[PDB]
Amino acid sequence: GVGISTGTFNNQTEFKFLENGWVEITANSSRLVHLNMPESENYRRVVVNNMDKTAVNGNMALDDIHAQIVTPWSLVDANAWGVWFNPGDWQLIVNTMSELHLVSFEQEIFNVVLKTVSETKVYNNDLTASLMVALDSNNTMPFTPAAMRSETLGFYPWKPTIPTPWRYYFQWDRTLIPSHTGTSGTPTNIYHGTDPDDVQFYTIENSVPVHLLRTGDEFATGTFFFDCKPCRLTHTWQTNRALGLPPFLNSLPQSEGATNFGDIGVQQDKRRGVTQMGNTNYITEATIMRPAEVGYSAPYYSFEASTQGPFKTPIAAGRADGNPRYAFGRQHGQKTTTTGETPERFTYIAHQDTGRYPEGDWIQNINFNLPVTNDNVLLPTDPIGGKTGINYTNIFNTYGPLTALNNVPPVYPNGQIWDKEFDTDLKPRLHVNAPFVCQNNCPGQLFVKVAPNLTNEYDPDASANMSRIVTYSDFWWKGKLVFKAKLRASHTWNPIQQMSINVDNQFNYVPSNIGGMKIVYEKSQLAPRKLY
Amino acid sequence: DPDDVQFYTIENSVPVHLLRTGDEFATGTFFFDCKPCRLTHTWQTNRALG
């Protein structure tokens, strides 16, 4: 019978507890997905060119030249934490778990309905129409995670959602010689077409099977099993000066009050220890050989060009710069009843304190005559190339064999969960955009489309666009995301940083009288982990 | 920084043994996993390969 409902909603976050303190967090998630018919009948190349908006000199960073194929298909990506955990679940996870393993994942579509509209308007069912569904089980297609544009499924369970129209990058050749306001003329700023040798026109129809669901069937993905290294829900505080055995106090203070300070008694050059100051005797906390380097300075706001055009060189971590900034809309955490097109924004000021503070760095000459003269120092205030606004720290890079770093923290709700590793022989050690890097063939992107429901007028020999019966579909999406996590232990006397509702946000998470609701951003790595 | 504060007592972190002038304490033998060390040095700079 066509009328039999063929799937059950489920959004309950299970928590099963195993031996030796591991817990299987397991988020079911469900949403209603609304798919409109594709306006573009067929696959479509486009080149975007905001020539005027970047031709005015000194506006290099506004460049948006790219070439992309836009398709009749749409993507139902669930790769973001807000799709799976509510604020309470996230609170329990961050406030109790320490280590976290991404285990397995699966999706299904059920209870699809399809409708055809007509002239005031009328809405009619069409039991013969079909949703098209395809899952890229071998990751043939371009991997296009919707998180980085904030185009994943809506985070609210009860609100409907729409899948993003799918597109992918074609190849292009482009150059843009930078400039500044007051440059004497137009720089070279041109689009060299596309190189023949590297075009890749993928199509969903050719690469992967398509199932037709015809208004009464289910699609079900198999359980994919991940292989990622675990993420840590705890941060490190020990910067480089705080590694190793501290000096010994000769004279502790003898009265209470914050103004009092303890004294190292030994003179500057009479201390004992090991330094890399191979020619100079002053052992100091700044000069003593710590075991290795934590964090690294990287050239901040550095832009580099391939032949596909300029891009910002990424940074791993930092104290203004470095910290990521997320811009997101109605379905992705804004107060839903707020009018206007402007997105809401935050910068995630992480506790991942392995960053750098460029205003404090300096160089000085090898002789190290200690009360150093101006000619033997390079400070952050000194110009490079006569440009007063650019200092040595802008161009500096202390990445080295000795450097050590942590993974990027999770960020809730807008953060990405997983990401596929680059398919190169030498692979990047970390991914800036998600914590859990894949190693092998991580979940097949699920593409959906409505089958063309054409009228009697059709004639494919005519070049005009084909006349669709204007149609749309609703279907219920459901998936299961399995983790395994280790609960925290109280190694330290002091309490660790709680996450908690409080007087300054008690009216934040609760819904409003007008029915609007919001998800605010939340920290992830709360408790401190001893690095050394 | 309160986010970073840690405070360890030995007393609430490790078991303690009280020896009272007649006993002895011995560890178990820890076994290492270290990579080897080479007691030899490489003289070839980049100029001297090939």
XYZ file of C-alpha atoms in Angstrom:
582
model
C 0.000 0.000 0.000
C 1.217 3.454 -0.999
C -0.146 4.986 2.207
C 2.044 3.089 4.670
C 4.521 5.359 6.424
C 7.944 3.758 6.105
C 10.224 5.362 8.713
C 10.326 6.854 12.230
C 11.640 10.232 13.343
C 14.389 10.063 15.948
C 16.519 12.843 17.430
C 17.337 11.344 20.838
C 20.988 11.627 21.880
C 21.765 8.256 23.416
C 24.497 7.838 26.022
C 25.569 4.232 26.609
C 28.243 3.521 29.207
C 30.878 0.816 28.696
C 33.528 -0.912 30.781
C 36.619 1.051 31.840
C 34.905 4.419 31.640
C 34.376 4.726 27.898
C 30.929 5.990 26.868
C 29.281 5.551 23.468
C 27.713 8.882 22.653
C 25.312 8.234 19.786
C 23.310 11.051 18.223
C 20.344 10.205 16.090
C 19.210 13.214 14.092
C 16.150 13.860 11.941
C 14.831 16.767 9.892
C 12.311 17.581 7.193
C 14.040 18.519 3.916
C 12.291 20.587 1.239
C 13.659 20.212 -2.302
C 12.404 22.520 -5.025
C 12.770 21.648 -8.689
C 16.111 22.806 -10.160
C 15.729 26.083 -12.018
C 18.677 25.226 -14.247
C 17.572 22.360 -16.464
C 21.095 21.113 -17.166
C 24.757 21.271 -16.182
C 26.153 24.767 -16.502
C 29.632 26.290 -16.587
C 30.030 29.818 -15.227
C 32.995 32.122 -14.707
C 32.509 34.737 -11.992
C 34.372 38.017 -12.357
C 34.037 40.977 -9.988
C 36.369 43.047 -12.150
C 35.287 46.512 -11.018
C 35.194 45.607 -7.324
C 38.931 44.701 -7.418
C 40.217 46.920 -10.261
C 40.305 50.021 -8.049
C 43.870 49.952 -6.749
C 44.594 48.635 -3.282
C 41.541 46.316 -3.231
C 43.411 43.098 -4.004
C 41.763 40.920 -1.384
C 38.262 41.442 -2.804
C 39.120 39.239 -5.824
C 36.502 36.556 -6.491
C 37.479 35.201 -9.914
C 36.728 31.509 -10.219
C 35.153 29.035 -12.613
C 32.549 26.561 -11.426
C 30.102 24.003 -12.770
C 26.587 24.390 -11.368
C 24.385 21.358 -11.591
C 20.758 20.231 -11.328
C 21.608 18.278 -8.163
C 21.589 19.361 -4.511
C 23.542 18.176 -1.472
C 22.154 17.054 1.901
C 25.415 17.418 3.872
C 25.162 16.841 7.633
C 28.851 17.486 8.403
C 28.527 19.969 11.257
C 28.125 19.575 15.006
C 24.931 21.619 15.218
C 23.103 19.050 13.090
C 23.579 16.372 15.770
C 23.917 17.800 19.295
C 21.644 20.282 21.047
C 23.180 22.716 23.553
C 22.522 20.392 26.482
C 24.208 17.449 24.788
C 27.202 19.618 23.968
C 27.297 20.796 27.580
C 27.453 17.248 28.903
C 30.027 16.237 26.287
C 32.469 19.087 26.833
C 31.983 19.221 30.604
C 32.540 15.473 31.206
C 34.431 13.886 28.294
C 38.180 14.196 27.676
C 39.083 12.113 24.630
C 36.674 11.631 21.732
C 36.673 9.102 18.876
C 34.479 9.458 15.803
C 33.272 5.899 15.205
C 30.578 5.459 12.559
C 27.923 7.261 10.558
C 24.855 6.521 8.466
C 21.933 8.213 6.726
C 18.560 7.341 5.272
C 15.705 9.103 3.481
C 12.075 8.120 4.008
C 8.476 9.320 3.759
C 9.124 11.309 0.596
C 6.169 13.174 -0.906
C 6.040 14.997 -4.244
C 3.622 17.698 -5.368
C 2.731 19.619 -8.525
C 1.360 23.156 -8.269
C -0.938 24.997 -10.672
C -3.110 28.097 -10.940
C -4.955 31.639 -6.685
C -2.535 28.733 -6.525
C -3.432 25.065 -6.086
C -1.307 22.243 -4.643
C -1.746 18.691 -5.961
C -0.126 15.349 -5.251
C 1.569 13.401 -8.059
C 2.050 9.804 -6.962
C 4.037 9.048 -10.145
C 6.816 11.611 -9.619
C 10.173 10.559 -8.188
C 12.939 11.983 -6.109
C 16.348 10.993 -7.473
C 18.953 9.988 -4.874
C 22.623 9.084 -5.301
C 25.360 8.312 -2.772
C 29.014 8.621 -3.830
C 30.244 5.438 -2.185
C 33.759 5.753 -3.706
C 34.186 9.556 -3.358
C 34.400 9.977 -7.119
C 32.963 13.480 -7.133
C 34.573 16.686 -5.885
C 34.377 16.769 -2.112
C 32.339 19.858 -1.263
C 31.678 20.074 2.480
C 28.881 22.534 3.077
C 30.229 23.740 6.437
C 32.760 26.260 5.132
C 29.985 28.247 3.412
C 27.517 27.477 6.240
C 25.221 25.468 3.983
C 24.700 22.316 6.063
C 21.290 21.170 7.282
C 19.527 23.511 9.662
C 20.472 22.954 13.274
C 16.961 23.169 14.713
C 15.209 19.761 14.617
C 11.646 21.028 14.287
C 12.259 23.751 11.698
C 12.280 22.580 8.054
C 15.460 22.740 5.987
C 16.501 23.019 2.336
C 19.491 21.290 0.670
C 22.039 23.575 -0.935
C 22.293 23.575 -4.754
C 25.461 21.710 -5.653
C 28.409 23.057 -7.611
C 32.139 22.441 -7.925
C 35.236 24.236 -9.126
C 36.297 24.021 -12.746
C 39.874 25.018 -13.624
C 40.880 28.558 -14.492
C 44.028 30.598 -15.077
C 44.149 34.058 -13.525
C 46.687 36.645 -12.425
C 46.365 39.777 -10.312
C 49.487 41.820 -9.637
C 48.808 43.563 -6.289
C 48.843 47.309 -5.796
C 48.041 50.089 -3.340
C 45.944 53.225 -3.480
C 48.201 55.673 -5.249
C 49.737 53.080 -7.542
C 50.576 54.851 -10.778
C 48.276 52.855 -13.057
C 46.325 49.698 -13.685
C 48.224 46.533 -12.667
C 48.014 43.379 -14.715
C 44.613 41.933 -13.785
C 43.376 39.416 -16.349
C 41.763 36.018 -16.866
C 43.709 33.575 -19.043
C 40.851 31.188 -19.757
C 41.368 27.545 -18.839
C 44.240 25.184 -19.503
C 43.164 22.191 -21.641
C 45.384 19.734 -19.826
C 43.435 19.672 -16.529
C 39.708 20.103 -17.256
C 37.502 17.708 -15.262
C 33.776 17.800 -16.061
C 32.246 15.348 -13.612
C 28.542 14.523 -13.741
C 26.425 12.735 -11.167
C 24.585 10.713 -13.797
C 27.772 9.225 -15.252
C 29.818 8.563 -12.116
C 27.485 6.964 -9.553
C 24.231 4.975 -9.411
C 20.969 6.882 -9.039
C 17.974 5.377 -7.254
C 14.461 6.611 -8.022
C 12.299 6.584 -4.917
C 8.853 7.128 -6.559
C 6.892 8.359 -3.541
C 6.812 5.109 -1.515
C 10.349 3.728 -0.987
C 13.326 4.161 1.348
C 16.983 4.813 0.673
C 19.437 3.650 3.323
C 23.172 4.143 3.508
C 25.269 1.428 5.023
C 27.151 2.099 8.223
C 30.391 3.812 7.256
C 33.142 3.325 9.852
C 35.647 6.123 10.402
C 39.394 5.770 11.045
C 40.321 9.160 12.522
C 42.773 9.924 15.284
C 40.964 11.040 18.460
C 40.262 14.658 19.279
C 41.059 16.080 22.706
C 38.435 18.093 24.581
C 41.167 19.523 26.856
C 43.616 22.355 26.176
C 47.248 22.981 27.099
C 48.421 25.995 29.100
C 52.171 25.419 29.285
C 53.784 27.770 26.839
C 57.511 27.429 26.330
C 58.642 29.303 29.442
C 56.554 26.983 31.665
C 58.117 23.665 30.627
C 60.585 21.947 32.914
C 61.805 22.363 36.454
C 61.521 25.991 37.647
C 64.425 27.780 39.347
C 64.935 27.370 43.102
C 63.883 30.163 45.428
C 66.645 31.278 47.767
C 64.381 33.640 49.760
C 60.640 33.095 49.909
C 58.533 36.069 51.046
C 57.740 36.373 54.746
C 54.388 38.200 54.731
C 51.084 37.822 52.920
C 49.787 40.165 50.224
C 50.054 40.194 46.436
C 52.647 43.005 46.460
C 55.265 40.659 47.941
C 57.558 38.720 45.593
C 60.071 35.932 46.069
C 63.718 36.449 45.140
C 66.207 34.272 43.338
C 69.362 35.027 45.272
C 72.067 34.077 42.813
C 73.491 36.749 40.527
C 72.776 36.902 36.809
C 75.846 35.032 35.533
C 76.442 32.792 38.595
C 73.373 30.581 38.003
C 73.613 26.914 37.008
C 71.951 25.202 34.078
C 72.101 24.629 30.343
C 71.500 27.193 27.600
C 71.809 27.404 23.844
C 73.547 30.761 24.480
C 76.764 29.230 23.241
C 78.869 32.379 23.770
C 77.136 34.122 26.706
C 76.911 33.165 30.358
C 73.630 34.710 31.539
C 71.227 31.894 32.386
C 67.711 33.333 32.544
C 64.222 31.951 32.241
C 64.227 33.362 28.707
C 67.503 31.640 27.771
C 67.424 28.244 29.510
C 67.029 25.333 27.112
C 63.443 24.200 27.307
C 62.924 20.693 25.893
C 61.336 21.799 22.612
C 59.208 24.537 21.081
C 55.440 24.815 21.503
C 53.579 26.805 18.882
C 55.154 28.742 16.067
C 55.076 32.200 14.584
C 53.816 32.371 11.009
C 53.686 35.333 8.638
C 50.394 36.959 9.518
C 48.095 38.194 6.746
C 50.390 36.819 4.067
C 48.826 36.349 0.628
C 50.378 34.075 -2.003
C 49.508 33.354 -5.616
C 49.262 30.153 -7.544
C 48.197 30.443 -11.160
C 44.592 30.112 -9.922
C 44.938 33.476 -8.147
C 45.846 34.814 -4.719
C 44.843 33.270 -1.411
C 45.536 33.850 2.272
C 48.205 31.569 3.667
C 46.602 29.675 6.580
C 47.662 29.961 10.208
C 47.419 27.208 12.801
C 46.743 29.171 15.992
C 47.164 32.581 17.568
C 46.082 34.945 20.293
C 42.966 39.717 16.303
C 44.602 37.362 13.799
C 44.568 33.589 13.482
C 41.373 32.850 15.390
C 38.616 31.805 12.957
C 35.572 33.965 12.278
C 32.239 32.310 11.457
C 29.413 34.081 9.605
C 26.046 32.338 9.706
C 22.357 32.822 8.991
C 18.810 32.112 10.171
C 18.923 28.311 10.106
C 22.465 28.166 11.557
C 22.140 30.010 14.888
C 20.769 33.510 14.358
C 17.774 34.631 16.343
C 15.335 33.409 13.717
C 12.915 36.333 14.121
C 15.552 39.025 13.459
C 14.876 40.810 10.172
C 17.366 41.839 7.511
C 19.981 40.099 5.405
C 22.972 40.771 7.665
C 24.489 37.554 9.094
C 25.485 37.110 12.713
C 29.187 36.728 13.418
C 31.600 35.604 16.091
C 35.335 35.080 16.332
C 36.201 31.949 18.300
C 38.762 33.125 20.844
C 40.003 29.680 21.799
C 41.760 28.650 24.984
C 44.289 26.853 22.740
C 47.035 29.102 24.096
C 49.966 27.761 22.017
C 49.808 30.936 19.911
C 52.140 33.890 19.563
C 52.177 37.577 20.493
C 54.070 39.451 17.737
C 54.405 42.726 19.661
C 56.805 41.068 22.150
C 59.265 39.382 19.796
C 62.728 40.610 18.928
C 66.006 39.655 17.292
C 69.422 40.708 18.477
C 72.974 40.374 17.274
C 75.048 37.308 18.071
C 77.532 39.105 20.325
C 74.770 39.655 22.897
C 76.354 42.560 24.741
C 73.437 42.621 27.097
C 72.339 46.281 27.574
C 71.896 46.242 23.855
C 72.226 49.296 21.599
C 69.774 50.229 18.850
C 72.043 49.141 16.007
C 72.137 45.546 17.374
C 68.357 44.945 17.815
C 65.439 44.459 15.463
C 62.223 45.279 17.274
C 58.601 44.882 16.146
C 58.528 48.674 15.700
C 61.298 48.717 13.064
C 60.254 49.073 9.381
C 60.921 46.495 6.684
C 61.676 47.928 3.250
C 60.869 51.424 4.487
C 57.192 50.506 4.926
C 56.450 51.823 8.407
C 53.395 49.615 8.920
C 55.134 46.286 8.194
C 57.673 44.863 10.646
C 59.935 41.829 10.698
C 57.321 39.735 12.488
C 55.036 40.009 9.473
C 57.611 38.133 7.340
C 58.931 35.825 10.084
C 58.409 32.068 10.259
C 59.650 29.890 13.122
C 58.253 26.606 11.891
C 60.994 24.129 12.490
C 61.687 20.557 13.489
C 61.336 21.451 17.158
C 57.789 22.813 16.877
C 54.743 21.173 18.458
C 51.054 21.980 18.134
C 47.564 20.820 19.051
C 44.649 20.006 16.803
C 42.223 22.777 15.985
C 39.465 22.852 18.625
C 35.891 21.872 17.876
C 33.555 24.852 17.677
C 29.825 24.495 18.226
C 27.373 24.806 16.367
C 28.819 26.030 13.081
C 32.001 23.932 13.121
C 32.703 21.031 10.787
C 33.002 17.473 12.136
C 35.093 15.555 9.545
C 37.150 16.282 6.443
C 38.870 14.159 3.827
C 42.655 14.214 3.737
C 44.376 15.628 0.673
C 45.206 12.967 -1.913
C 48.929 13.786 -2.120
C 51.993 11.730 -1.272
C 52.976 14.252 1.427
C 49.909 15.085 3.512
C 49.271 18.056 5.823
C 49.853 17.335 9.484
C 46.629 19.068 10.570
C 43.503 20.450 8.940
C 42.416 23.916 9.935
C 38.757 23.357 9.097
C 37.785 20.282 11.142
C 39.197 18.146 13.966
C 38.717 14.621 12.622
C 40.789 14.086 9.480
C 39.863 11.019 7.454
C 42.373 8.552 6.018
C 40.232 6.366 3.689
C 37.098 7.223 1.728
C 35.013 9.041 4.328
C 31.266 9.271 3.931
C 29.731 9.372 0.495
C 28.131 12.715 -0.198
C 24.385 12.261 -0.705
C 22.943 14.065 -3.729
C 19.238 14.581 -4.436
C 17.283 15.917 -7.403
C 13.715 15.740 -8.700
C 13.197 13.643 -11.814
C 11.971 15.839 -14.727
C 8.164 15.692 -14.838
C 7.635 17.045 -18.336
C 4.449 18.159 -20.087
C 3.018 16.898 -23.375
C 4.460 19.859 -25.303
C 8.038 18.568 -25.149
C 10.258 18.279 -28.210
C 13.964 17.650 -27.462
C 14.919 18.641 -31.005
C 13.888 22.208 -30.186
C 16.596 24.232 -28.445
C 14.212 25.934 -25.992
C 14.307 24.962 -22.319
C 12.074 22.004 -21.537
C 8.683 22.725 -19.953
C 8.587 21.148 -16.499
C 5.385 20.737 -14.580
C 6.358 23.006 -11.701
C 6.955 20.622 -8.832
C 8.646 20.160 -5.494
C 9.212 17.479 -2.894
C 9.425 17.014 0.845
C 11.283 14.138 2.451
C 12.413 13.209 5.940
C 16.148 12.685 6.420
C 17.508 10.651 9.308
C 20.965 9.575 10.382
C 22.955 8.061 13.227
C 26.367 9.342 14.361
C 28.309 7.148 16.798
C 31.201 8.290 18.998
C 33.217 6.762 21.804
C 34.525 9.015 24.583
C 36.506 8.855 27.834
C 35.181 10.563 30.957
C 37.311 13.061 32.853
C 39.269 12.326 36.047
C 40.030 14.818 38.836
C 43.813 14.831 38.704
C 44.044 18.329 40.246
C 42.879 19.909 43.487
C 41.356 23.028 41.950
C 38.075 22.780 40.037
C 38.298 22.980 36.257
C 36.384 25.458 34.103
C 32.698 24.593 34.045
C 30.327 25.354 31.202
C 27.086 26.599 32.691
C 23.954 28.626 32.198
C 24.113 31.740 34.356
C 22.350 35.018 35.066
C 24.048 36.726 32.103
C 22.591 34.186 29.630
C 19.541 32.625 31.392
C 17.347 34.350 28.777
C 19.687 33.336 25.914
C 19.002 29.645 25.237
C 15.282 29.652 26.149
C 12.945 30.486 23.210
C 11.363 33.918 22.872
C 7.706 34.886 23.181
C 7.529 35.654 19.443
C 8.734 32.081 18.818
C 12.231 32.967 17.659
C 15.158 30.938 18.948
C 18.938 31.086 18.729
C 22.039 28.974 19.218
C 24.992 30.909 20.623
C 28.544 29.718 20.140
C 30.122 27.687 22.933
C 33.656 26.783 23.936
C 34.878 23.197 23.472
C 38.255 22.607 25.153
C 37.606 23.554 28.774
C 39.675 21.523 31.202
C 43.477 22.074 31.220
C 45.800 19.221 30.221
C 49.396 19.143 31.414
C 51.593 19.228 28.323
C 54.782 18.161 30.079
C 44.413 32.692 33.966
C 41.649 30.699 35.736
C 41.212 28.585 32.608
C 44.771 27.290 33.063
C 45.006 26.877 36.834
C 46.406 23.565 38.055
C 47.501 22.673 41.586
C 48.928 19.275 42.505
C 49.608 17.839 45.891
C 51.606 14.659 46.012
C 49.187 13.573 48.725
C 46.066 13.605 46.530
C 47.905 12.363 43.404
C 50.163 9.395 44.260
C 50.213 6.669 46.946
C 52.776 7.262 49.696
C 54.774 4.656 51.618
C 56.119 5.221 55.139
C 59.443 3.491 55.664
C 60.145 3.921 59.425
C 63.911 3.224 59.574
C 63.770 -0.524 58.823
C 62.047 -1.075 55.476
C 63.049 -0.739 51.829
C 61.108 0.350 48.744
C 61.809 -0.748 45.174
C 60.168 0.158 41.897
C 59.098 -2.265 39.267
C 61.390 -2.318 36.264
C 60.110 0.243 33.775
C 60.748 -0.801 30.167
C 61.408 1.883 27.575
C 60.132 2.238 24.007
C 62.841 4.640 22.814
C 64.230 4.854 19.312
C 67.985 4.168 19.013
C 70.761 6.716 19.377
C 73.733 6.786 17.018
C 77.191 7.299 18.516
C 78.505 8.358 15.089
C 78.370 11.660 13.240
C 77.666 12.572 9.636
C 80.366 14.620 7.935
C 78.713 15.098 4.553
C 77.137 18.501 4.130
C 74.943 19.118 1.100
C 77.988 20.050 -0.982
C 79.496 16.545 -0.588
C 76.681 14.168 -1.628
C 76.489 12.173 -4.829
